[PDB]
């Protein structure tokens, strides 16, 4: 979820993508319209 | 007790402006619990309701004549007046000014929605 290799593909022109990040939806706040969520940050940026 | 008496000539030329001023006696239009109405009776026809006005200036009219009829208010003179532009030869009739109270009633029984006081009227002549 948070290291090198969270997103994988076989070639830059391919359509098949594998993903293993965490995604959980949470309750909206009172009086507001929005879609909050929680997710692990990208692993490629961390490696750089 | 409130009584209604009018003023204004009942003789007008065609396509001109017909104006009827109904003055309040023993009362005032500053009251916020009453409407103010104008009604006509054509020869061979019953009473035709034209609409009503409110003391602040709120207005609503009959769909047929709304394109021409315009009501106003005169608090200092304690009067309410009607103005009907583009009069026709078919507009010769007898008019009456009347009043009615409005309030939040319940149980389907109330005095609301009925004309309680009436004027004397005029015989309008629309001719050249």
């Amino acid at each position: 979820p948070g290291q090198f290799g969270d997103i994988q593909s076989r070639t830059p022109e391919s359509k098949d993508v594998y993903a293993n990040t965490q995604l959980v939806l949470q309750r909206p706040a009172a009086g507001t319209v929005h879609v909050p969520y929680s997710q692990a940050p990208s692993g490629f940026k961390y490696w750089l | 007790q409130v009584q209604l008496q009018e003023s204004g000539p009942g003789l007008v030329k065609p396509s001109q402006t017909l104006s009827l001023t109904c003055t309040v006696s023993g009362g005032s239009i500053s009251s916020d619990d009453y409407y103010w109405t104008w009604i006509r009776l054509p020869p061979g026809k019953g009473l035709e309701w034209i609409g009503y006005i409110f003391y602040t200036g709120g207005t609503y009219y009959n769909p047929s004549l709304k394109s021409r009829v315009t009501i106003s208010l005169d608090r200092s003179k304690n009067q309410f007046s009607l103005k009907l532009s583009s009069v026709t030869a078919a507009d010769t009739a007898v008019y009456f000014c009347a009043r009615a109270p409005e309030t939040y009633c319940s149980t389907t029984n109330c005095y609301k929605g009925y004309f309680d006081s009436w004027g004397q009227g005029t015989l309008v002549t629309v001719s050249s």
Partner: protein, 107 residues
């Protein structure tokens, strides 16, 4: 708009008889109907309100009835001063209109 009609268009009866006039509306108006009496040269005067009760100060000989769409005006006994013109009027939904009326004459 609510369309109203009255029957009969004319009334001819002697002194002491019972006179009944019916008012029919094209739309439901529940308990919103009244009765107005018009003298010659004068404006109509309301005598019946709430479609059943009579106006205060009016003699008790006048009464009303009917419900839903058909309403009947009932006078217990005709009198010389009752020969006038009578109308009905509804008070449920705007715009508010009037009936065609009926003329009462001595038989």
């Amino acid at each position: 708009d609510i369309q109203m009609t009255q029957s009969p268009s004319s009334v001819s009866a002697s002194v002491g008889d019972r006179v009944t006039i019916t008012c029919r509306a094209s739309q439901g108006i529940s308990s919103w109907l009244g009765w107005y009496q018009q003298k010659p040269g004068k404006a109509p005067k309301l005598l019946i309100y709430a479609a059943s009760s009579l106006q205060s100060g009016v003699p008790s000989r006048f009464s009303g009835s009917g419900s839903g769409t058909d309403f009947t005006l009932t006078i217990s006994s005709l009198q010389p001063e009752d020969f006038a013109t009578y109308y009905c009027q509804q008070a449920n939904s705007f715009p508010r209109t009037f009936g065609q009326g009926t003329k009462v004459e001595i038989k």
